[PDB]
Structures are given as structure tokens and as C-alpha cells.
Amino acid sequence: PQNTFLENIVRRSSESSFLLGNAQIVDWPVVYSNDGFCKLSGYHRADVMQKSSTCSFMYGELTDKKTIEKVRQTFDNYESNCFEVLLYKKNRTPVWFYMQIAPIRNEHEKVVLFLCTFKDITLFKQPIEDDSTKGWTKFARLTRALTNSRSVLQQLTPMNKTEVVHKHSRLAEVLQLGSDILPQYKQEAPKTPPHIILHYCAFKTTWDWVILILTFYTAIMVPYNVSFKTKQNNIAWLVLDSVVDVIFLVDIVLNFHTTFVGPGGEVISDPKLIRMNYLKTWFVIDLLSCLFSSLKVVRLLRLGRVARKLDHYLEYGAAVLVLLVCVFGLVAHWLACIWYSIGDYEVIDEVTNTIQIDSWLYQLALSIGTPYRYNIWEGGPSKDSLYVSSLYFTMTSLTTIGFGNIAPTTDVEKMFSVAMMMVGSLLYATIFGNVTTIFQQMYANTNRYHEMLNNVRDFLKLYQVPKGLSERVMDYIVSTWSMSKGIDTEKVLSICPKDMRADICVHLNRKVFNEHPAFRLASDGCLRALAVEFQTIHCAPGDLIYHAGESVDALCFVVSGSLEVIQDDEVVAILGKGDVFGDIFWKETTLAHACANVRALTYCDLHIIKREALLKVLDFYTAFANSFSRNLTLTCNLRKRIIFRKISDVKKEEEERLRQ
Amino acid sequence: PQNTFLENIVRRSSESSFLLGNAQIVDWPVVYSNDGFCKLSGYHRADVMQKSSTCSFMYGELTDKKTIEKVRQTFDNYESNCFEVLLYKKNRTPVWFYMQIAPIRNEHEKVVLFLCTFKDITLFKQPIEDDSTKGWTKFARLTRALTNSRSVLQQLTPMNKTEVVHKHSRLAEVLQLGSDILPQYKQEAPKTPPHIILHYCAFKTTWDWVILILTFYTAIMVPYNVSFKTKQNNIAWLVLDSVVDVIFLVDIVLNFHTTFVGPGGEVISDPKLIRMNYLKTWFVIDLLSCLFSSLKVVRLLRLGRVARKLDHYLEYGAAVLVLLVCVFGLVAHWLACIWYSIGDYEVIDEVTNTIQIDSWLYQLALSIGTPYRYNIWEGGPSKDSLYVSSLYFTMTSLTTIGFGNIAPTTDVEKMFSVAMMMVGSLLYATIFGNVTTIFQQMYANTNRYHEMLNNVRDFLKLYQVPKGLSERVMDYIVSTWSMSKGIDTEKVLSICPKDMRADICVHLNRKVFNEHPAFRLASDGCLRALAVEFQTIHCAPGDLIYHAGESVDALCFVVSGSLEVIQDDEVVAILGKGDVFGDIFWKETTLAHACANVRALTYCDLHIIKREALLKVLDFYTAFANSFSRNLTLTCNLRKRIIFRKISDVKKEEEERLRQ
Numbered sequence A, B: 001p002q003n004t005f006l007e008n009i010v011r012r013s014s015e016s017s018f019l020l021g022n023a024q025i026v027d028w029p030v031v032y033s034n035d036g037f038c039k040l041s042g043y044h045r046a047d048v049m050q051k052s053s054t055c056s057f058m059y060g061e062l063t064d065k066k067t068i069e070k071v072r073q074t075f076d077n078y079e080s081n082c083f084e085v086l087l088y089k090k091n092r093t094p095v096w097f098y099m100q101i102a103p104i105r106n107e108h109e110k111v112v113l114f115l116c117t118f119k120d121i122t123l124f125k126q127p128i129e130d131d132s133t134k135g136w137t138k139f140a141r142l143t144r145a146l147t148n149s150r151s152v153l154q155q156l157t158p159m160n161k162t163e164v165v166h167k168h169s170r171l172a173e174v175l176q177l178g179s180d181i182l183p184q185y186k187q188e189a190p191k192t193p194p195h196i197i198l199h200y201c202a203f204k205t206t207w208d209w210v211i212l213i214l215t216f217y218t219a220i221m222v223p224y225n226v227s228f229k230t231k232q233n234n235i236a237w238l239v240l241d242s243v244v245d246v247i248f249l250v251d252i253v254l255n256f257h258t259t260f261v262g263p264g265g266e267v268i269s270d271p272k273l274i275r276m277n278y279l280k281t282w283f284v285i286d287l288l289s290c291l292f293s294s295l296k297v298v299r300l301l302r303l304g305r306v307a308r309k310l311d312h313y314l315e316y317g318a319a320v321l322v323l324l325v326c327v328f329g330l331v332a333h334w335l336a337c338i339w340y341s342i343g344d345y346e347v348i349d350e351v352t353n354t355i356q357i358d359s360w361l362y363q364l365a366l367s368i369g370t371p372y373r374y375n376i377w378e379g380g381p382s383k384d385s386l387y388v389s390s391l392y393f394t395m396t397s398l399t400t401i402g403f404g405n406i407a408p409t410t411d412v413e414k415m416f417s418v419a420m421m422m423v424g425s426l427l428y429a430t431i432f433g434n435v436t437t438i439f440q441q442m443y444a445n446t447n448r449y450h451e452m453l454n455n456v457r458d459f460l461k462l463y464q465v466p467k468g469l470s471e472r473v474m475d476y477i478v479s480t481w482s483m484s485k486g487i488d489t490e491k492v493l494s495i496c497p498k499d500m501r502a503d504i505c506v507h508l509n510r511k512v513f514n515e516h517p518a519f520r521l522a523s524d525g526c527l528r529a530l531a532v533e534f535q536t537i538h539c540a541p542g543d544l545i546y547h548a549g550e551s552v553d554a555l556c557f558v559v560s561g562s563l564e565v566i567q568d569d570e571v572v573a574i575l576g577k578g579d580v581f582g583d584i585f586w587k588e589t590t591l592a593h594a595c596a597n598v599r600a601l602t603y604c605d606l607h608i609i610k611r612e613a614l615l616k617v618l619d620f621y622t623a624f625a626n627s628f629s630r631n632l633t634l635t636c637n638l639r640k641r642i643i644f645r646k647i648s649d650v651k652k653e654e655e656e657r658l659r660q
């Protein structure tokens, strides 16, 4: 979905000086100045911007008061007009301009912008100039200002007193241009000319699959009809052929109304280019449809016509395996048809009207019971037994089995099998290369995990790591691969741009930015700065986050599980399910000593933000920092040491006092 | 092993205000306040914490002295009671609360915690209020305080003078709740409901393997009985079938008492979910057990029943190869049974009672001696020769050998072999993809080492490195791969969390932290900080650690071998087996010049800690640094240069003096 608005204006204006300006703002500041307005006015695109769209920066002591109010009036209430005025220039040269103010709406009509296409007219207006010494210089400036008016604009009828053909010609031009040049400032979609079908539509996919099915049917059925010569008695076998031919003719017709992707861009819906491409490329498919062995062998090119599109149906994976099976079947069928075609030409030699003994059909008849008999020679084996036996031989010859009960033996079967054994070998090699590559690609995901497990196990066994640590490490590896099965967050987030990465990071930490009072008065430009530095750890029971001597270096937000803050082998706090613990990193300026052991009691989920990153973010948005300091209350500050006395010490002191 | 204690309390309390507090500490500080206690008291979970668990932070001038002593009494000696008191609130609103103090023990009874579940009761107590202007406001507050009491708590019998049904109803409620809500504060284990069997237990694995063996037996034996039709004469072949059927029925019964792992978690021992899952999933296996070709072909689904669990038995490696062999055998057996089933229906045509000559059993009888004879047609070949010959043909057809002495030739054997040659090709392709992938994974470990050796050899040969250096480099590579065969410490330590990495690093350097006086008064939080930065080098004889001009930058502890400190080609120290050498990095603030060559005399083992890391650790724990400086004595300080004079110089000076 593109918002092309600056492309529709320029193409449909023929080198104008349009000066788009905002409408909702007071005084209507401009937002864009075309290059044409930068040469017909002398100003650059650094002084025009943020000035009024009424073109009030080139007023003066000679502009008429009868029209200076009218432009403001027509800007007040949203309507289009074609006033003309007298404006100055950067070099203080008076010149008459022809304004064409016209409103431009939103997707829902809200008049967002104000098109202000200009047009220089000086030859057609009365020459007036105050600061001049020679009167002919004004007439010279008349021609100097209008150079294109005598070349392409108004040279149709060059003759005097022709003022009306300049005013009344384009009074309501924008009204006539309401359909030509007044686009809609909306997020558009790929537009299609009339009677044009997109190639991403939900209709072309179904038609493509139907064409695939019908091409597979034709590939199966054409050689069988050509070689075995089934007599056309049933009506169905003819109406089906007629329907298929009509459908593929309709497909050829529809190929003239499809949009091919540009070589260096995206979809191009231009009929001329589409027709040129299809004329240049694919009459190989036009030959087959228009109208017997030769005709049907020509029709077989329809398989190539459906295979030219072998990217909308397929992928690289199991689909390639299915295609490899389907092409092996078709090759085994085509070779079975050619083998019977060869083996029927040699059975009966018409020169002597005698049967050839060293053929393959005669030996079939000699090893199946039914022989050939002479009336001409009458029938022999059936026709449902000459296809099974002809496919069986080619299956023995393509799978490299070769039982050898049906063998090539005359003169030509031996030199046809030499050609068959080459195509069979080539197909077998390609199949057994593709299968290996596909299987390696498929199982490359589950080999890294086992390799890592073996590496870790060998490491833990070589260095004689104790049983407890080895069990904990193996359990951690298995658990972390059981919920993150091959997915690495860093690799996926690295290939995304700076905008989508921040949004994904904000989405991941949605259980800390939503259910926490601290992250309430935070701008969208600050959440996308905090979320990038948030980490996450998946603790296990018994795991220690902070030991009794480590330095607290990061805030941690618990979103699942429970924690236990043990100090002097005494529980002083039980955090869990939305409790923040750590140190006040902003108002200390010093690292602290973790004065208690934080041990996990359940499989936890902590979101960690480091001290340096938190200070870097908080030292830049020095407005959210106040709210963060005034709204974040740590339930367990691991810098202040709590002082207490167990009851055992009290009892011992009481006993000591009782002693003396 | 999870320590779930905050989950058992909340579920079994029905939205209470439990206020767990410590017991061993004096005054019983609290350690956790439920959200309920944060709305029935107005306090947040930042002021309640570290206050007394007797709820002494909401006392006042109206609480009764007859019960304020009783709560302290029952807290002194560990016992449970259900006192009720009058307490204030954060907004100074008097309200009556119903305390339910109850002790909570450890794994070994030590009364760790004190559950202090509260309950608001105001409607049922005498309305008393001091700071009020209107008397009806107190009655309004009676209803305002108790909103859930008229909805779910005590709306069973709404009627007046019903005070007893509020007091005596739950006097000893915690005594009745001693089994409902009073968990044990211990590191628990996955608990199982009665009559529920875990799937990790040592019993389910043996039963699974038994099911695997019996399914393999059934897969072997069912087609043989169906096709070859062995007459059931022996008692064993029937009692074995009955026993197998009974065992698999018992397996179906036990499948109702197994725990399947949750889709987004771990084991779930809930009978309702287990039954719902098994009802939804697997009556395909219930059909086969309950009660002839069709029945046994249905029974063959038991193989799918045992293959659905193809992750508890298998792995990715040689086990896949064993499975591939075992499935090839079973396919060759099933095809051998189907081939004999086809080849027995065609031998004798019952329409004419004549033998078909172009079958495969008749040609077997014609090429094995024993023919078929007519009495009906009597027996021919034996029954132990019709299975060997039927498996031989399928082995020729699946291994793509095809001797062709037994061949498909009638009408149906040719169209059954066409279907056999497709499944054979598919199985062969999958097998030869899996074998290649498995072999690549297996031998990928020993290809990196040879590739590195070849790279190093080509590097040393291209640049014409001298013989000595090349030999030393190759020996070093071979030696370092002979004791670290593929294991990289950094990769294994990088995939571990911050807690296990420190423990592993401490374990690795156990020969320096134990047998050294310097690392004696070191806290557990300091050894885990030093051990991460310790390195290790495996020297070789003749290798120099510090040359005569290098800068000493790290402390080195020798744990194996011997070293030689040569200065001016004179030995001044022989370090070995627990001797530290280097420079005093803390009390110098300046880099030094190594004034002697430290050469290895034997295959050594040095543990190296750099200067910057050592200073960073020692500048943070400024209590261990004093002990480290007062307990570490270097036996060879490579900053102080020793001054001496060889005897040769003395002799030369004496000779010079004797000269004149």
C-alpha cells in the first residue's frame, strides 16, 4: 500500500509550479514547493517553506485590493477557483501569475491540503512597470517572462487581439481537471486498469491449480491415445477433450490480462508492456492449442506451459519430493508408451506377412498362452494386458532391477534401451542428489541440538565435574531447548530494522510495561528505548540470582514464579508475581554489596535491566526519571542490611544472666 | 523439585488475606503480605513488611487488653488459635478482624512460618465508633465493611439473632483445615493423585520395552498366520496369543492412569484432562484389541500404537540405523506374505479345475522337482519351501538385484510388482538419505581435526618455516588435541547461566583454591569472582613463559611439572608443584621487566590470572585483599634482579691481580 501523491501531481501537470500547503493550520503554511516554483519566483526551497499558501510572501505596493481579499476568502471556505494576480519576485520584478487553488481531501473527506498550481502569464497582460528607464525594456520583459507560451502553451493561433482565447479557455480548468489532476491524499492500493487481472488475486491461484490438474491429465492421457490408439466410441472421451481445449484457450486469452512483475521493481499494470512481453515470449504455447501423432505431440508442450510457473505451486522441501515422484511416474508412463509403439511395428512384417519371432510381443504371447493367429493376422493379447506388461518392463529398466523375462532382443529394442538407460541414469542421479540435499536440510535443525548435548556431556565427563553440577547443567540445557527449540532471539532481531526491532522488544516485555505503576507516564519514545535493553532469564529451583557477596548491577522484575531472600539463614522476604528487587541505581552513584541470597523456589521468569543502560536512558529523558523515582518502590532493596536477633540468642542470653 | 508454597495457600483459601511471617526471629517480622491484606487494611506491600506478624502495627486506644496478650502468648509457644480483635486502618477506621494464626513447619518439624489468615467481620459485631457525628453512619459502615458476607460468606440463613452460627461455625476451623490449608514449607516433588502412574517411573519404561517386543512379535507373526494359514494344532500358539492380547488390554487400561506432558508446561496429573485427551486421541488402538483376515489386519494397527511413542526408545544416530534395518526386514516379510497370497489364488482355476501354467508357483514346482498332482488337486511343494522362495523374490525385488528366475508373469503379478517397485524405491531413497545424514553427523567431529592439521601443515610449508619451529607447532597441535579432543571450554561455558558458570569455574581451579594458604579466608562470593578470570596453559619442555625483556602481566600458579628461572645463563630458582611466581601487582602501580627466562623442564600446568582482572577483584573486596597481601609470598619475583658473580670472574680477577 503506497501513498503516491507527489507522483500523480507531477505526471498529470506537465511541468507546473504546484505549491501544496496545509489547510487545518492557520495562515495555511506550505509543506512542499515544486522545482518549477523555484525558478518562476527566484526563491529556493528553504524560504518558501512555512510561509502562507496564499502566496503572501510576494505581495507589494502594486497588487490589486480587488483580488487580494478574494484569495483569502476562497481559502476560508473550502472551494476551488482560478484567480490571477500580480506578484513580485526575489529580484523585485513585477509579474502576473495565474493561480489555480483547489482543495485536496483525505480518505474520508476532511480537506487536508490545498493545491496551488501557478502559471506565468506576462505577454497576455497589460505591461506595467514603475522602476524602469526605458519603455521598450518592459516589452522585452514581456517576452522574456513567457518563453514556453510561444512554444507549447498558446502558439496555436498566433495573432493579435486574442485575449478571450487566453482567459475563457481555462476559467474552470480545475473543474475539468477534477478527474485529471486532483488525487486523494490517502494510503492507496495497487490500482488496476479496466479489464486487467492481478496475479496475486484469489482467482488466479485457483485457475492456476486447475490448469496444473488439467495439464497432468493431458500428460497422462495423450500418449496413451496416440500409441495404443483407443477408438473414440464413448462420448465422454470427446466432450472432456473439447472442454479441456476450451479451458486452455480461455487460459491463453486470460494470459493477455495478467500483470507480470517488473524486472527491477514490482507489478506493472500497463497493457502495452504486457502484450509486448507475451508476444515476445510465449507463442510456443499458442502453437499447441490451435489444430494424429504430430498434433498431440505438439499438444504435449502444454506440460511445459504449466511448468514455466514452477514457483507459485512449489517450495524447497517435501514438495520437491512429491514433484520428483510425479515426474518419475510420468517418465515411466511415456517410456512405456514408446516401448509399445516400437514393439508393435515389428511383430508382423508386411513384406512377407510373417511374424517376427525375436520381438517382445510375440514372446509375450508365447509366455502368456494366447498366440497370434492368421485368418491377415487376427488379434492376440488383450489391450489391458499390453499396457501393464509395457509399464512393468520400463519399471524394471528405470529402477535398475531388470528381471529379464521381458528383454530387448530384435535390433531396435537394443538400440532404444541404450537411449533409455541414459535418461534413466540421469533421472536417478538427479533424484538421489535432490533427496540427499533435502534430507540434510530437513535434519540439520535436530543435529545441532544433539551435537551440543554430546559436547556438553563430553566436557562434563572429561573434567570430572561432580554429579550434582552435571545433572543441573544437563537439566538446564534440556529445559532451555524444550521451550526455545532452535530459535535464537538475537539472530532474528538482528536482521530486522531499527523500527521493527523496537516494536518487537516492546511486545516481548508487555508484562512489565503494562502491569506496573512505574511504567505509566512514559512516552512511546521512551518505552521503545527501555525495551531494547531488557533481558530475560529462566531460573530453576535452587538457583541463586544474587549471592551474599556479589555486586547488585541490575533491576529485576518477576513476572512468574517465586523467590526467597535468605539472610543469615533466615527468610526475610518472599518475592513473586510482580515484585521488583534490586538497588536504587540512580540515587546512589556507588555499587553495592548484595547482603542476602535470592534463591528461586519455583521456575521463575525475571526481566533484567542493567545499571549502565538504565542510567543512560534515565539521564536522557529527564522528565520520565522523576516519575520513575516517585513511583518505583522496591520490595527488597539488596543494599540495606536488616538487623535482627533470633530467639535462640535471646534464650542463651537469658540462661547466661540466670547463671550469674 | 519445586517448593510451591504460595500456590497451595492461595488456591485453598478462597481469596483470603494471609500474612505469612517469620517465627525464629524475635517480634516475628512478616515476609509476605497477600493482596487481600492490602485492601482490607489500606496498607501497601512496602510498609507492612518487616513489621510484627502479631498485626501490632494497627493497634490503638480501643483494642481490648483481654486479647492483645493472648496473641503474643500463642505466638510464644507454637500453637494455632482463632482469636478475633479490633484493629484500626490506614484511614483510622476501627474494624473487627478474625485472626486464624497457625504454625507452618519445615521438612523436619521446626515451625518455620506463621500463617496469619485474616477475615473481616463487622456486621456481626457490636457497632462501636468514637469519632463520628451521626449514629447511622456507623450502621452504614457495618454494611460497607462487609460486602462479601451478604453474597457468599454468611447469606445461607439471613435472619436476626444468629450470632452463634457465626462464632461456633468456625471456632476450630484451622483444626478442620489442618489437612486442607496447612502445607509443609519443604522442597517438594511432583505429587501424584491416588491410582496414577508417572511416565518417568522405572516401571513404565520396562512395560514400554515389553510392549515394543510384543508388537514386533505380532508384526512378524500375524501376516504369516493370515496368509500361509497354519492350522492351530499346538496349544502354545494359542496360549501365547491369549497372553499377548491380555497384556495389551492391560496396557490399554494402564493408558488411563498415565500423565502426559502439558503443551506449554510439564507433567499434569489431572484425571479429567488425561481421560479427555485419551478419548479424543486414540481409540484407533482401542478398535484393534476387541474382537480371519480382516480382524488380524485390524490388529496390525498395534504396530502404529507402539510407533506413536518413537521418542522414548530412539535417538538420532546408530539407533536410526537399527530401526531402518528392522523396518526393511518387516517390509520384506509383509511383501513376501502378500506375494504368496496373490500367487495361491491363481494356481488352480476352480471354474475349469485346471492349473494355470503362467503362474509363479507352478513354475516353481516345475523347477524344483515336485509337481502338482490330481487325485481335486493334491499337495505340491512343502510349506517351509513356499516361504523361503517367497521371501527370496521380495529380497531380489527390494535390493534391486533381480536374478529373474522367479518373475511376475501372469496378469496380476505384473501389476502388483509395479506397486512393489514404488514402495521399494521410496524406502530405498529414505534409507540412503538417512544413512548419508547420519554418517555425516557422526564423522563431522573427526573432519575438523584433520582439516586443521592440513591447514597448519600447508601454512608451515608455504612460508618455509624452519624444521624446529614446524616440528614444535605440529607437536603442540597433536598434544593439545590428544587431551582436549574436540571440547572447547569457552563454547560449553557460554551456554550456561551466570550461576552454573561460576561453580564450574571454581571446580576447574580446585587445585589452587584448596592447596594454598592465600585462598583460605575467602568468602564464597569472592572465589566465584576470582575463578572466572583464571586461565590455564599447558606448557611443553623448552617452552618459555617469560622472556628476558617481556612485561610481567599475570600471576601464575604451578600445579604440575617444573620450571627453571635462568638469569645470565645461570639457574637461580627451580619452581614446581605449588610455587607461585610473578610480580606484586597491587603494591607497585607500575609494569615491570621480566629479568629472567622461565623455561619449562617438564610438561607443566599453570593457572594464570591477569593483572587487570586481579586488581579489579582486589579493589572491590577490600577485606580479602589484606589477607591476600599478608599470605601470598612469591618464590620468584620477576621484578627484582639478583646480583651475583661467577667463580670464573673471580679467578680472572685473581689472575689479573697476580699479573701486577
Ligand SMILES: [K+]
Pocket (backbone or CB within 6 Å): A400, A401, A402, B400, B401, B402
Ligand atoms: K539389477
